[PDB]
Structures are given as C-alpha cells and as structure tokens.
Symmetry: D3
C-alpha cells in the first residue's frame, strides 16, 4: 500500500504512469511547477515526491538521490505504484571537446561502470533507453533550440576515481580506471554521470521505459568557466526539455 | 592501398561512406540491384562486395559472413576505405511469442554474447546502434509496409548453444546458457542474432555509425530450425527495408 | 575551499578528524544532538552536515544517502577536509534466525555486492573495517546493554533484487542473486545493508579508518518489508552506540 | 534430414566420419581433389562442402569461414550428420622469430581470445586438440619434411585489435590487447589465428576429435616478403599434410 | 576413522577444539613443546600433527604446508574431528617500508590472490578473520612486547609472480601482477603471505573461527629473498605469540 | 647460491635438466631408487629433493606437496637451477565410468580450477603439457601394459568442494562447483587432480616442458572397492612409467 522508502501510495499518484526523476530533491518542486497543479506528496531521505498534471494527465516527479542504488529504489517503488515510464533529467559535464556548455545530451547507451545494473541483468546486457523515450527526448531537446548530442554516457558508481579525478584525498585511481577517461573519450563517450547505467539496465530488463537527458554545464576538456547566466539557462532548459519529452510520451 | 580481405581499394568504392552489410554473400547482389548502377567489385571468402548508387550517392554492399569475427574484418577494412555508416541486414530468431515470422526487428541494443565486441570495448560498454541509423531503419520498415519491432537483441557467438538450442549433436547447453532464452525473454529481449553485438560495439566505440535490422525467419516459441518456405519472402522484405533505410541515411 | 557536494569547508569542521555517517539525513541532527554544541553546517541533496563536540573534540555528522555512490562522495570530501575516521550507523535486515529485530551488528567484513568498492580496489581486496573502530563499536554496543553481533555483512547495490526480495514489480531476481540469501545465510552472513562494502573498501585502501554498526529493523527469515513499529527505538539505540564508539576512538 | 546452414544430408556424406575444415570455401575443391572421387555437395554462405574418398573411406571437406561462430555451425551440423573427427587446415602468421615461413604449426592448445568457446565450456576449460589428431598432424607434418612446431596458438575473435594490429582505421587497441602480442610471444605462443579456440573447446567438450595444422606464410617479426613460389609451396604442403593426417586418423 | 590426509583420529586429538596451523612441518614440534605434554601424532606429506595441552585443554598443532590447497585440506579434516578454531602462524614479507623483520603482523583481512578461497565463497566475500581470534592475536602479540601491525594481507597463490618477485627464471610477471606490489603498498596492505585468503574465507564461510599472525622475515621494499640469519628468531617470537593467542581463545 | 625453499644449489643437481615431481615427499626416494646412484639432496617443508642418474644423465626427483602454490615454488626454484623439463607423477581418482582402477591417465589439458595458474597466464591460456612429454608419457604408460587414457583433467585448488564432495564438515559446496562434476563428466573430463593446471600453465608459458601422468586408484562412479594388490600395483606402475617417460625425454 505505502512503499517503504518513498512514503507514497498509488492513490497519491492519481493514475500517473510517468515519472520525471531528477537526482536532487531540491529540483523536484521546480520541475513539478512547470506543469499544472503541482502537489507535494512526500519527502523522506533523498526522495522528494511531487505530483503534477501535464495536458490533463498526472505526472510524478521524484528525486532519486545520487547513484544507482538510491535510484533503483525510487524506480522500483514507483513501478509498484503503477509508474511505467521514467524520464531521467539533470545536468552533466561533457568529456568531448566538441560538446559545448548549453548543449543537450540524450543517452543512447550507458557504459556500465556501476554495480546496481548487475542486480537486474548481467554485464553483457545493454544499458539502453527505451526507443520511444530517447526519441521523445531528442525531439524535445532539439525543439528547445539547443545543440543535441545522441550518444553513449559513462555511468560511474563514483564521482571521483570512476571519472578518473586525481584532485582527491589519495590523489590516485585504481588500476581499472587509470587512463579510463582518455579511453572513453577515444570511444566517443560524451559524458560521465552516476545513475544512467542502473536506470537504463533496470528498466530495459523489467518492462519499464526509461531514458536520460542532460544539459551540459561544464566540459572537462575546456578550461573556460561557464558564467552563472549560462548555467541557469542550461538548468532551466534541461527541465523544460524533460517536461516536453514527457508530453510527447503521454497518450 | 588494397585491404587484405575485401580485396578492394578506396577508388573502387567511388566515394561511398555508407555500407549495407548482409551476412549472406548471396544477398549482396540482391541488395545492390535494388539500387542504381550496381557493380561487382570483389568476392573473396565470405566477402562479396558490390558497389551501387542511391539517389546519386555511392553505396557499398558487402557480406560479412556469419559471426562477429568475419564481420569485424569487413567493417574495419571498409572503414579504412572511408565507410562511416554500416547497415546490417540479417536474419533473426524471435524469442517473444507475439513476433511473427516475416516481421522486422531493429536492434536498439545488443546483449553481448559474443567475443569480438570485447576486442573493441570492455563488456561494460553498450552495444548500441547509431540513433539516426536505428531511426532510419524503423521509418524504412514502417514505410515498406513491414511490421517492425524496436528492442534489445541477444547477439550470440554461436547459433546453437548460445541461443539455447537443444536439437543438437550433444543436446547439451553449457551452464552459462542454460535457461538463458527464458531469461532474455523475461527481460524483454526480442530476438537472437549473431553479429549485432560485435558490429554495434565496434562502431559505437570507433566513431562509426551502425545499426541492425533483421527479418524474423523463425519464432523460438515454436521451433529451433527456421522453416524454408518463408525465407526468401522475409529476406526480400528486409532488403527493401535496409535500402530505404540507407536512402534515409544519405 | 568548499567541497563540491557537501558544501562545507575545513574551517567549518573545527579540526574534526572523525565523522559519524548515517544514511538518513533526518538522523544527522539526532546524532549531533547526543553530543555537545551541535551546529547545522549545510544541507545539499542527501548530504546534511552537522558539527558537534565530543569530550572537547570536534566531530562531524554527515548523511551519506542510500548506496555506495553517494557514500563515496561524502567520505572523499570529508577526507579532503581532514576527516580520517568514519563511523557508519544505519539500518539493516538480519538474515540469521538467531538475530532479533533491535539487535546491533558490527560488521567485521562486507560481501561486496556493490560497484563503488571496485572503484577503489579490485574485488580480491577485503571490505574490512579498521580494527580499532570495530573494537570500539563492539565495546560501545555492549556497554549500551544491547545484544551485539560481530560478523560479515552482505552489502548490496540494491534494496530489492540484490537482497533477493521477490515482492516486487517484476517479481523476478536476476540469475546471479537467485538463491543468494540462502547462500549468505549458509556462509554465516549476518545481515543485508547497502553501504558497508563501499565504505569499508574505500577507507581500508585509502588510509582511512572505517566501521559499520547497524540496527536490525527486520529479520528476512520473516518478511521483506520492515515493520514501521520499533523502527524508532532501534534507531535510538544505534546512534547511542555510535556516539560512544566515536568517544572511544577519540580517547 | 538436411542441416540448415550447410544444406547437406547424412546421405550426401556417404558414411564419412572425418571432415577436413579449411576456412576458405575456395580451398575446399583443392583439398577434395587431393583425394579420390571428389564430389561437390553444396555451397551456401561461407560453407562449401565436398566429399572425397581416402583409402576407400569417405572424407568430408567443408569450409568454415573466418571465425569461431561460423566454424561452430559447420562443426555442429557436420556432427549431426555423423562426423566425429575435424581436421582444421589453413595457413597462419607466426609471432615467434624462430618460426619460419614454410614451417608447420600443430596446435597443442589455444589461448581462448574468442567468444564461441565459452558457449561450450567455461574459460577454465582448455582449448586442447584430441591427442590422436595432434599426433597424426605432427606425423604428417614432419613426414612432409617441413620444420614442425608443436605449441600454443593464440585464437582471436578479431584480425586487427585482437592480434594487436595498430595499422587500422582508429589505430587503437583496447586496454585488454595493448602489449598482448609481446605477452604471448614471451609465453611462447607460436601464432595468431581465429578459429582454433572455438573448434578445440567445442570438440573437446562434446566428444569430438579435433586438431589444427597450419602452414606459416608470414611472420609478424619478420620484414621479408616470401616469394610467390614459397607461398604456393606452403599452401600446397599444408593441405597435403592435413590429408595425410586424415589418412593416419582413418581406421 | 582416520582422516584421509592428516592420518589422525578424533581420539588422537584428545578433545582439542583449537588448532595451531603453521605452514612449516618443522615448526609443529616447536609450537607443541611450548605447551604441556607435547606428543607426536602423525606425519604424512606436508602434514605433521602434534598434540599438546594448554591450561589443561588439548591443543592440536598441524602443519598446512605452503598454499591454500594443502591448507584447505588440513582445515577441513581437522574440522571433521571437532576443531573449530584455527590459528595460523606463518612467515611473511613486509610490503610497507617501516614494517621491519621480526615484527608481527595480525591479518584483519586478506586480498584474495588465491584460488582455493573461491571454492568456499565467491570473490565478493571478505577474507576476514574471526573477531575473537584477531583480538586474541593482537593482545598476545602486544602483551609479548613484539612490534605488532594490524591490517590487510595480500595472500597469493604463488611466492614469485603473485608477490611480484622478478629475480626468477623468466624474470617475467604476468600483466595482472605487474606493479601490484606498489598498488598494495599504496592501499596500505601490510604484507605478503600465501594461506590467509584461503584460510580466512574458508572458515568465515564455514562457521569456523580463524586468524593469521605472521612473523616478518623480509622487507620487500629492499629485496626478494629472506635473509636466513633472522629466520629462527622471528619464528620463535611468532610461535610464542600464537600459543599465547591460543590461551586467550581457550575458556 | 641455494634456492630459498628447496635448499639446494645448481651444483647439487649435477647438471640435471629434467625433474620428476611427485606430490608426496615419501615417494621421492621410491622414484629415485628406480634410477642409478640416487642421492638425498635436501628436505625442507613438503620439498624432499633427490638426485639420481638415468642412462648416464642427472635427473632430479623433487616433491611438490599438494596444490599449485607449493608446486609453483618447486618448479620455479628448480628452473632457476637449470631444470627445464618437469614430469608430474601421482595417483588420481577418475570421474569417467570407462576409466578403471589400474589405468593410466596422461593429461592433454587441464581445467584450471586453481588460482596459481593465473599468476603465470590469464585464464584464456591453455593448461597444456609439452607435446613431447605427453607423448613420452603415453608411450611409457603403454609399454607398462596398463590401459592408457589421454584426456582433460579437472585441476582443483581444493580436495573437497572443488571436486564436488559433500561428505564434509559443512556438507556444503559453493554455487560455482554445484553440479560441476557432472559438467566435467559430460565434457569428457577424465579425473580430478590438484596440481596440473598450475604446473602446465606455468611451464607452457615459461619455456619449460611439463606433463602429468597418474595411475587411477579410485573411480567416483564405481561402487566397487579396489583391493590392496591392485592399488599397490598401480602406484608402483605410475612411478615406473614416469621414470621410463623421463628416459624417453632424455
Ligand atoms: Cl534463429
Ligand atoms: Cl616473503
Ligand atoms: K602444499
Ligand atoms: Na544516494
Ligand atoms: Na564467418
């Protein structure tokens, strides 16, 4: 009746079969307010849950927290309450020099540098979005006017060594990830993030539709720092895009 | 420069940056003749190479043979000669009951039950098609009147135990693949095929655009050996689709 | 010099070298409250940070959120700011019949059913706590009058399939985890939780001291979803213990 | 009655229990014509099937195409039709400086750098030839007057990165295969090819007798290009040897 | 009624529930004679078995030989005869620069660079000692006045390449172990040894209590082969420690 | 210059380039006495080392103890002292019905269910004996009059769960090895053993010549208990065979 982590019932969802899932709980209300009659449902741990209405249809907005584990919980419990489509939205740092701040990335596949994806399908299984969702996301992102990159995302269970960051406490990176960023860059990988492999694998192997869209707020190959105005616009466009993607997904 | 296996030069390709790559060498000419001015280029081993023209643009048709290994050779050598986009048109076995023989399946991602993909990217890397290619294949399949399915393909380095076929000489399936078909089926995997994992991983990790459309010649809900009656019709439909998909990519 | 996620500085920590790291942001204040001069530092995402004083020494309390990924971020950024010792206090599902709800388990080693641990050390590396911390946790737990169990914890990147829960949306569990709970039970594994493998492996391979003590909120031999009853009193004991464990580490 | 890929029946084989299996379909007739009454059976895909008679006994010659996958099909379908002994013949590129063009390599074991072998046996299983076959091949090869090398062959699922070739489109080789040729060389590996691991593992784990014999036509460590006559002699010798090996295998 | 390899009966053990298990057969008599009424039981292969009495309780001393395999046999067959606690006392090579010859190392966890541990638990399982044993070992070692180190031990199935020794016949080390010693050192791993991974994993997963204490006979930051001069003295201190650790475990 | 574990020098071996390596130290003298001028060199741990003479050539006999780890030490340290050929001899339990007690098994390849082999070569590398050694062993075994089996051996790091034994303290076998004996049986594996994967992988990847021969003294699939006479005859034949195998190698 009431799922263990989200603290929400099916009734609270008002027939919603689609959820927009940001990572940050503070972003949930912002996304919900883009739609009609946003309603606060619950807030427990990293899970802030809102409901809103899009073209007369109920839409859930639920934060996942950082990482596949907390994400897998949110998706599972929402799925128990009837949610079938999951739209990942956020902002990300690109690792390709041709990708600029303000561009949109729609994940076509994820490098599974996570662990939670393995709890739903063996490693050989592709962390791939639902085609309709990826299509809707591409459409919404392009209609926003932004430059849109359809490509592979490296999905890491860590923010630091898994994204080959050396500016750390130990300043070192395990053997597996040494020189990994260059390897991903050469393989055409667009960006790092921390939830897509879990989300895509879990859903693609569980009869759920999922996809990931993100605004690029920084480029690790570029030394130039984006201004607050461009960052604000990119954040806003990212959530505008995901809501329009939701609109395209609704029937 | 003449590539080792394909036996063709970049000049032979006449500026072609797109290749249609069937597995069956006999399908190459059949695909090429759906296009303009088809010309036989070379035939060596499982590699039959034709060149043709589609809306004024050169297109290569080149068989890959069966399997990731022979496929990886074909793509690499075509890539050396300037080909950047690869459209696999193949035959496949459906593992979902609702899929019918004669249907088309466009791979959105491949289960990597192959070995060759590992020679281009670690297993964590997704065997995913280029989005434009997958989109073009879906559109082409629909516009050709075909019934098309978008979804995950289990891409196996074997035809028999890796696709959990039991009607074999030993009748055994190695532990790893025991119950695998139902596991894939439960996970929503649409079909079995042998080249998509290699092709998709190799291309997605090498700056090449790839995709796989395949005609369903069998449903594993019924049997293990594809009926010989529907093969040619299904193939004919698939090549119509892949050529139209190529047209959309150009 | 503020860390990326936690939003705190080294100055904010007032020389703290020890951190208590609950998973639940709500539990942070509750822990800091048991110490002297608790002060809210920051709250961003699943990271709520308080500072407090224990026997005249500054102690950080910082939520990790659910899962290895968000935990690894908290630990790394706290480490950048001078923290060297991390005490996880959390909730857990015991899988041994002789362990009761309300009991406490000090992890002596974690089964690495996560992904983040691999970003710090290969799978062969033991997810083992610092010996001094485990010692301090055992003594603190005993001195609190509660029944304590020393032993191995299965640390999963998921709450559902990785802990072999079948009462789910798909009702399926991937081949890897089919029959896994019985396997762990037969191997003497005490409980399931979601952060210890990451925490212990990361710290044991990074020159950081870590340990995990957890209150049993459910016995998996009985059911899959923990009773909401006694969730509070179990939580109350665990944080009492972890503070005393911290006191022993600072002595 | 008719096998799906090869397009032949048991009757077409005329009681043959031994098959010579070259990679190249264009080579099948050549091998068959070394024996008595060569008869074209079928040609489909990379599979050209001939029948011939050796000392009054029927022998099948069937191409496999390049790679374990296409090979596994031919072996399986031939096995269904009664073939129990499989003699791989072809030419190869050595990686040892002491192995010269014109020499014969008889595989005593294969490094499993393929995928198909795993579909018959886990990686721990040795890709080993049947001892009688290896013995017969060594005998035939030595009786040919050529210098014969008995040793380990590296069996790669690719021609390019798996054999650490950098003269490619991307010019890159995955981490796994970087420095791999030198590793194999130092381990005494004689040559690269692309079928033996699959063939040998499949047969050894399925009650089939298999072995691989190859003429050396190029050496990765040598810069000299062998002349046309030498290449022709080596090709001719290789198929003469495999037929003589078949003769020794026939009972 | 005699166990397969050890050649002893339960009656021979005289009610012993605790075993001291050195690797060296010659060390068995030395250990036994530190206690009361030492008696030779049997010697077959690498298994020399003695019995003695410590505070009126029977203690069995049994060599394991070198390696997880022979160790697993000894542990199993002793467990068949009622032994529940296993104290490994061994020799070890220091990985850290300031762990000196003659120091004692108590293993808090083992890097599983072995194969035998996998025969009892998958790699995710922690090679961790029983807490009481590790506690008793630390106490005994510290009370003895020895210089004691608590920490992670790299436990290898080989003495040479698995402990990155280069002064060997080939002078080669497989890719996996190239640079591994520095990796372990940077991760804070204290020492190399060959039995702890198997012993600890086996026991922790089989309801047996185990621990490993080892005398440092070489510092690997200096050389590869232990000097003979300090062997006897280091061994003498280590066995004094393990006997006292046995005393602490008995009750 | 004495090697650390074996406690012998190169001079001690008197130019020996071949070693016979039984697992049991007690069997070293029994092997050495089949040859000329046997001499005790050293005994430390599980390593009893003898030197002997076979047709005028020095041959070392050295025990390895049970398991790959201790075996790898002996092989390495002997190799440092000039030994290049290693003949493992022992007795084993067969898992195939057609393999009777008294028969001889010459390993053609080993299932690497060990850990030490990985310290010399990745798992993909075949645990294969030197062909001359295997050939010499087959010949020597045949000349003794015993039925000889050439085939794959499952080489386990444990005696109990790795050989799927349930008559143990816990009675438990880890998931990996559950049903494993039947798997190997179906794959035609002849026997279980505990040293060959390490020995063969180490030597085949290090320019050393190795092989394994073993008399069968028990069959997992047979109820019948072998009598003392046949057992005694089998262990005696095994060492006779390995000495003759050594003779053929020299
Ligand atoms: Cl099919
Ligand atoms: Cl050492
Ligand atoms: K041993
Ligand atoms: Na989280
Ligand atoms: Na092929």
């Amino acid at each position: 009746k009431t799922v263990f982590h989200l603290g929400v019932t099916e009734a609270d969802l008002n027939g919603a079969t689609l959820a927009i899932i940001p990572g940050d709980p503070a972003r949930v209300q912002k996304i919900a307010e883009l739609m009609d009659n946003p309603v606060f449902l619950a807030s427990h741990r990293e899970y802030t849950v809102y409901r809103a209405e899009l073209d007369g249809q109920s839409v859930v907005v639920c934060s996942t927290g950082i990482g596949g584990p907390s994400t897998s919980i949110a998706v599972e419990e929402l799925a128990q309450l009837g949610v079938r489509t999951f739209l990942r939205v956020g902002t990300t740092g690109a690792i390709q020099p041709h990708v600029n701040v303000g561009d949109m990335i729609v994940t076509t596949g994820s490098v599974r540098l996570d662990g939670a994806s393995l709890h739903f399908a063996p490693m050989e299984f592709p962390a791939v979005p639902d085609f309709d969702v990826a299509t809707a996301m591409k459409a919404a992102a392009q209609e926003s006017g932004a430059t849109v990159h359809m490509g592979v995302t490296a999905s890491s269970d860590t923010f630091y060594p898994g994204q080959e960051r050396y500016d750390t406490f130990t300043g070192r990176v395990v053997r597996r990830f040494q020189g990994s960023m260059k390897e991903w860059q050469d393989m055409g990988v667009l960006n790092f993030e921390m939830e897509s492999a879990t989300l895509l694998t879990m859903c693609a192997s569980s009869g759920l539709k999922a996809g990931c869209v993100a605004g690029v707020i920084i480029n690790r190959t570029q030394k130039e720092i984006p201004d607050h105005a461009t960052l604000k616009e990119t954040e806003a466009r990212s959530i505008k895009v995901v809501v329009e993607a939701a609109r395209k997904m609704l029937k």
